[PDB]
Design a protein around this ligand. Structure first.
Ligand SMILES: [K+]
Ligand SMILES: [K+]
Ligand SMILES: [K+]
Ligand SMILES: [K+]
Ligand SMILES: [K+]
Ligand SMILES: [K+]
Ligand SMILES: [K+]
Ligand SMILES: [Mg+2]
Ligand SMILES: [Mg+2]
Ligand SMILES: [Mg+2]
Ligand SMILES: [Mg+2]
Ligand SMILES: [Mg+2]
Ligand SMILES: [Mg+2]
Ligand SMILES: [Mg+2]
Ligand SMILES: [Mg+2]
Ligand SMILES: [Mg+2]
Ligand SMILES: [Mg+2]
Ligand SMILES: [Mg+2]
Ligand SMILES: [Mg+2]
Ligand SMILES: [Mg+2]
Ligand SMILES: [Mg+2]
Ligand SMILES: [Mg+2]
Ligand SMILES: [Mg+2]
Ligand SMILES: [Mg+2]
Ligand SMILES: [Mg+2]
Ligand SMILES: [Mg+2]
Ligand SMILES: [Mg+2]
Ligand SMILES: [Mg+2]
Ligand SMILES: [Mg+2]
Ligand SMILES: [Mg+2]
Ligand SMILES: [Mg+2]
Ligand SMILES: [Mg+2]
Ligand SMILES: [Mg+2]
Ligand SMILES: [Mg+2]
Ligand SMILES: [Mg+2]
Ligand SMILES: [Mg+2]
Ligand SMILES: [Mg+2]
Ligand SMILES: [Mg+2]
Ligand SMILES: [Mg+2]
Ligand SMILES: [Mg+2]
Ligand SMILES: [Mg+2]
Lengths: 122, 203, 50, 117, 151
RNA sequence: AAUCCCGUGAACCAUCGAGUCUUUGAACGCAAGUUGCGCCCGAAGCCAUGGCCGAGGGCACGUCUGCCUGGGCGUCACG
RNA sequence: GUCGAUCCUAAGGGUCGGGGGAACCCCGACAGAUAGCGCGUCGCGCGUACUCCGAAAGGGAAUCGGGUUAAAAUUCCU
RNA sequence: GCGACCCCAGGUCAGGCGGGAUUACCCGCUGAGUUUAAGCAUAUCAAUAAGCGGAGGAAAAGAAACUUACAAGGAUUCCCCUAGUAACGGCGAGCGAACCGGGAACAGCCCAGCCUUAGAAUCGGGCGGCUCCGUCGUCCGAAUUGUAGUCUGGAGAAGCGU
């Protein structure tokens, strides 16, 4: 009957484009009917077809993005669109390892004289 | 250990050797723009005791600042006010020429962090400083535990908030006790605290 | 005037669209307080200022 | 030796960009395809008279579409050749295109296929 | 840039040069410089590739169950230490160190320590001996016994 | 509206992690009372290596590291 | 494509570098390795620091009759 | 002429950084007058408003070139008190802190310089692998006009042994 998203994800890339082409052509006819005094029932189909086009485009874009992220997986430099967004300030932060770097004497102090667990007898 | 010889030589600024070298350098600086990148510090011994390290990420710039006081920037030297405020000349800027040199470099070099600066030369018209700046984004700096503190956001534009070595001097923070107590934690913070009218619940 | 920029003509087009009565079915909604269009503009009474 | 007293900056080699990563992962989708360009035909009485009097089809088109793209959109959409295209921006901010077909094609026949007549 | 560097050269010779700076114009003679530099080439420090090559020969030697090298000493900080400790037998100073304050005092230190010194032309030439772009000065703590007469 | 009801499932529902996100604006090819005036790359398609066509993108300034191409007898060395 | 804007420059405006300035800002090609162009096929030659903005009355490539609408035309039709 | 180095220039060269917005609190600069003095000029209003900049969840300050004169306290900040006090002031109008003491909290540290010279032991980038905020290998660079270690006065280096 209507478009089911989980069924779209099982289609191939060519099929999605073919279905997208058909949906746009169908929507064009409905637009003509809207200006030629089309029946009220046919005018309600515009909303349904608009939803279908968006769903097909969403599936196509999601598959395309997913494949691209796999191609650049384990690469040093990624396209800016695929890099994490987060916030500007968070991206400029020192990494976790860098923030914890210390001089050799500071390292030795931690090993030689760390805080000890102790208690006072009552 | 050669730095002590260099440092002690620079303590004799009125000797013939230093007067000649400074005279030639002073001419050379006058012909170049007011802010110039230098390949290496003119005073490596002085630079490294202020934090400079000969590694990628550290850069040195020479800054030229005009000498003298601060004429009040008022049109035609006219002040609309009582005589106590009618002075126009013989007025002095509260910040020092060293601070101005750091600010000039900091504003121009927005992508770098100002670390410190030092005097290198002067004439009757201009005063010359070298400003040490750090590229906080460079990996060598970010992996160095002794300098990577400057990569943190709290240290943005230290020179424009008076947080450099020169900044502490003109804020009155070089010193403590009865002669400098009003300067901490800040002069305006001290004023606001002392002006506060504390109205407790049970009073 | 007849000589007009694209930007100005676009702004004038939007103002014309906004200068209409409210749909009648708006006043029949549940908990409706919109009585009429309070931002109606007449070319001769109030000027657009640009 | 130099025969010119004016010093000129010597020519130096310039390389073309060879980025290690693309700034955009993939090209953007076409936002002005045939369906986007041709929104819907105009079915006003004035527009209808031009179907037979002038063999012209009146379309409402995307404001960002130029005559070159309108001509190609009509070719792909209805498989017809155009003699000339005249465009104007209506007072409501939309763009109208007067599309005159060549004598080899009949606008009235094409209009029936569209479904306006 | 060209104009300033040419005016800089002129200005230096127009003004009176104090003796401490004028002593650097009296560089070693060309004929003797070649002989000195030829000897230095026989005591070049090992290269990066050569340095790695010996360290792998030692690792295998350590797994399978020796002489002190004789090479030129470079680095102003290290040379100054050798001069003060009186372990330097010859100090070679570049005449074109900028800033000159780095080495303007070296001749006085060598004279006070009774260590022979020479001023040669080219810090780049000295650097090439030690596989560096430039070298302010070079030092020889001891030469090989086979050529202690010409030295 | 044979859109949806013992359910891949209604909702002007809640929530968010996938995805889309026009023209602008610090606004960045140059401009602007202009949808004005440039240059470069280029998928797909198509006509016989070239030609047309063209989705889409790129070209601001300062600055750091590295790199390439250069200038000056600035300091030298060797022919 | 033919009417204009668009192009050109005017009084002038906005600017690089440089010089000032705590900074907002000031001066404005004046402290300077210009822009590039031409001809061959990447090389030679030339090369005086703005390829900027600034006119719907200045300068300026090209459209004329006849017909046509309730309302458009030197723009639609012939 | 061929090379090294130096300084500088060009690049849509490879990969990065910066601008702007927000106002309650925070940091720096700049800076009035109304007003009060029963007039008014110093003063006061005020080291304030307005102006120009820069940050963070806090900021700033901070491990004594201090307080004190005692039987001595011991980085900074904050609260109470000191106190409307010492002091300043046409000694007029007015103005005005600090130490001690009691509490909230509590934390200390890193460099520069003589000291690897039997080995720049340091770091970045390109490429590759892995257990991928990193690590290993290799290559090209940075750096001797000095990277990394050791040391920071409370110490410390060196030698000796517990
Ligand atoms: K005033
Ligand atoms: K007064
Ligand atoms: K223009
Ligand atoms: K004109
Ligand atoms: K004229
Ligand atoms: K005609
Ligand atoms: K590596
Ligand atoms: Mg460097
Ligand atoms: Mg009127
Ligand atoms: Mg108004
Ligand atoms: Mg038109
Ligand atoms: Mg722009
Ligand atoms: Mg535009
Ligand atoms: Mg004309
Ligand atoms: Mg003019
Ligand atoms: Mg201006
Ligand atoms: Mg400028
Ligand atoms: Mg000129
Ligand atoms: Mg020129
Ligand atoms: Mg022009
Ligand atoms: Mg113009
Ligand atoms: Mg005209
Ligand atoms: Mg008319
Ligand atoms: Mg690039
Ligand atoms: Mg009064
Ligand atoms: Mg009164
Ligand atoms: Mg009065
Ligand atoms: Mg204010
Ligand atoms: Mg800001
Ligand atoms: Mg924030
Ligand atoms: Mg807190
Ligand atoms: Mg802080
Ligand atoms: Mg201390
Ligand atoms: Mg205390
Ligand atoms: Mg009392
Ligand atoms: Mg007061
Ligand atoms: Mg206090
Ligand atoms: Mg207390
Ligand atoms: Mg060391
Ligand atoms: Mg020890
Ligand atoms: Mg010890």
């Amino acid at each position: 009957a209507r478009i089911k998203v989980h069924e779209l994800r099982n289609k191939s890339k060519t099929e999605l484009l073919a279905q997208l082409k058909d949906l746009k052509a169908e929507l064009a006819l409905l637009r003509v009917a809207k200006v030629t005094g089309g029946a009220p029932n046919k005018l309600s189909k515009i909303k349904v077809v608009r939803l279908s086009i968006a769903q097909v485009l969403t599936v196509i874009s999601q598959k395309q993005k997913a494949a691209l992220r796999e191609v650049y997986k384990n690469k040093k430099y990624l396209p800016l669109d695929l890099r994490p967004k987060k916030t500007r300030a968070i991206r400029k932060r020192l990494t976790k390892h860098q923030s914890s770097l210390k001089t050799e004497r500071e390292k030795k102090k931690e090993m030689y004289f760390p805080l000890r667990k102790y208690a006072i007898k009552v | 250990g050669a730095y002590t010889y260099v440092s002690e030589l620079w303590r004799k600024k009125q000797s013939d050797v230093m007067r000649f070298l400074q005279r030639v350098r002073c001419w050379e600086y006058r012909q170049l723009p007011s802010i110039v990148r230098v390949t290496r510090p003119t005073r490596p011994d002085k630079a490294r005791r202020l934090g400079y390290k000969a590694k990628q990420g550290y850069v040195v710039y020479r800054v030229r600042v005009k000498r003298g006081g601060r004429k009040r920037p008022v049109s035609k030297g006219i002040v609309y006010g009582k005589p106590t405020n009618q002075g126009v000349t013989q007025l002095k800027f509260q910040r020092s020429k060293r601070s101005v040199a750091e600010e000039r470099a900091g504003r121009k070099l927005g992508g770098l962090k100002v670390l410190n600066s030092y005097w290198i030369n002067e004439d009757s018209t201009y005063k010359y400083f070298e400003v040490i700046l750090v590229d906080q984004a460079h990996a060598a700096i970010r992996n160095d535990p002794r300098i990577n503190w400057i990569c943190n956001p709290v240290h943005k534009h230290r020179e424009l908030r008076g947080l450099t070595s020169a900044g502490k001097k003109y804020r009155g923070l070089r010193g403590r006790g009865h002669l400098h107590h009003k300067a901490r934690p800040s002069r305006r913070a001290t004023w606001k605290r002392n002006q506060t009218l504390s109205l407790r619940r049970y009073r | 005037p007849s000589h007009k920029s694209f930007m100005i003509k676009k702004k004038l087009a939007k103002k014309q669209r906004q200068n209409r009565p409210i749909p009648y079915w708006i006043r029949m909604r549940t908990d409706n307080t919109i009585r009429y269009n309070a931002k109606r503009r007449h070319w001769r009474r109030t000027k657009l200022g640009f | 030796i130099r025969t010119k007293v004016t010093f000129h900056r010597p020519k130096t080699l310039k390389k073309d960009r060879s980025p290690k990563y693309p700034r955009v992962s993939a090209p953007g989708r076409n936002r002005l395809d045939q369906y986007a360009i041709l929104k819907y035909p105009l079915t006003t009485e004035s527009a209808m008279k031009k179907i037979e009097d002038n063999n012209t089809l009146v379309f409402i088109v995307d404001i960002k579409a130029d005559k070159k793209k309108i001509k190609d959109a009509v070719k792909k959409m209805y498989d017809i050749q155009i003699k000339k295209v005249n465009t104007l921006i209506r007072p409501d901010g939309t763009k109208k295109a007067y599309v005159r077909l060549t004598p080899d094609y009949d606008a009235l026949d094409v209009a029936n296929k569209i479904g306006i007549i | 840039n060209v104009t300033l560097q040419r005016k800089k050269r002129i200005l230096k010779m127009r003004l009176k040069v104090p003796p401490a700076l004028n002593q650097f114009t009296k560089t070693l003679d060309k004929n003797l410089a070649t002989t000195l530099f030829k000897m230095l080439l026989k005591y070049r420090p090992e290269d990066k590739a050569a340095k790695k090559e010996r360290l792998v020969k030692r690792a295998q030697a350590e797994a399978e169950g020796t002489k002190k090298p004789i090479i030129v000493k470079y680095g102003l900080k290290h040379i100054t230490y050798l001069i003060e400790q009186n372990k330097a037998q010859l100090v070679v100073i570049a005449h074109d160190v900028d800033p000159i304050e780095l080495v303007v005092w070296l001749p006085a230190l060598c004279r006070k320590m009774e260590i022979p010194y020479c001023i040669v032309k080219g810090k780049a030439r000295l650097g090439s001996i030690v596989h560096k772009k430039t070298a302010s000065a070079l030092c020889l703590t001891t030469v090989k016994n086979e050529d202690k007469m010409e030295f």
